[PDB]
Amino acid sequence: RPLDTVQRPKGY
C-alpha cells in the first residue's frame, strides 16, 4: 500500500 498517506496520513 503506497497510498497509506492519501486516505489516512499520520495527522488523523
C-alpha positions as a printed Julia matrix, in Angstrom:
12×3 Matrix{Float64}:
  0.0    0.0    0.0
  1.96   3.23  -1.18
 -1.32   5.29  -0.61
 -1.1    4.82   3.24
 -0.8    8.75   3.41
 -3.74   9.75   0.97
 -6.84   8.1    2.68
 -5.48   8.39   6.32
 -1.93  10.03   6.89
 -0.1   10.38  10.28
 -2.28  13.52  11.12
 -5.75  11.8   11.78
